[PDB]
Design a protein around this ligand. Structure first.
Ligand code: GNP
Ligand code: MG
Length: 172
């Protein structure tokens, strides 16, 4: 890694990737966001351990039709925020596919230990389709990844999630 910590968000369309980035960077939420087409990135600088970090967050299209727009920018990522929505079972069932897509196109230095952090977003929705138990189980079984239940809407665990991504990058 260079000093610029590259954190990339991947996950199905509608799961809340753009909202998560926008909540963390600008502390805003929009109930009417449109689908992402080309990738977007934003810088964010702060202290995590009480130590100075410069990150660049890369937001990508979740929709299959835009795969070719996002895959060129996987390379050089330091951590991947694999995102699903707790109200969307298919988004969770697709996690393994997303991990495989990342690894294939990222060509990272050693794929076995690459840092993923898993976000089950929209935790504010009580009518969930995905259980915390099964999500925790997937994280354990597929690399013992950190798991966060998040809400871009009410801010729950959004900063926690990005802060953990930084903690997973630091050791390299
Ligand atoms: N209730 C709730 N809605 C959320 C949350 N995060 C995002 N949303 C909503 O879900 C919809 C999709 O959000 P968006 O951030 O655009 O999703 P995306 O993952 O970026 N989609 P794409 O990959 O197609 O760009 C929007 O209507 C947004 O307001 C959340 O935590 N809670
Ligand atoms: Mg988006």
């Amino acid at each position: 890694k260079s000093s610029l910590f590259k954190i990339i968000l991947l996950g199905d369309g509608g799961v809340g990737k753009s909202s998560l980035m926008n909540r963390y960077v600008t502390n805003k939420f929009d109930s009417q966001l449109f689908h992402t087409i080309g990738v977007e990135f934003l810088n964010k600088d702060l202290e995590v351990d009480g130590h100075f970090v410069t990150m660049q967050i890369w937001d990508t299209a979740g929709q299959e039709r835009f795969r070719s727009l996002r895959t060129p920018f996987y390379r050089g990522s330091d951590c991947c925020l694999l995102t699903f929505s707790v109200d969307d079972s298919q988004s969770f069932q697709n996690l393994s596919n997303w991990k495989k897509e990342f690894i294939y196109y990222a060509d990272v230095k050693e794929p076995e230990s690459f840092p993923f952090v898993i976000l089950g977003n929209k935790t504010d929705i009580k009518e969930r389709q995905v259980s915390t138990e099964e999500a925790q189980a997937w994280c354990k079984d597929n690399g013992d990844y950190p798991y966060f239940e998040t809400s871009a809407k009410d801010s729950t665990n959004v900063a926690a999630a990005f802060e953990e991504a930084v903690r997973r990058i630091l050791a390299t």
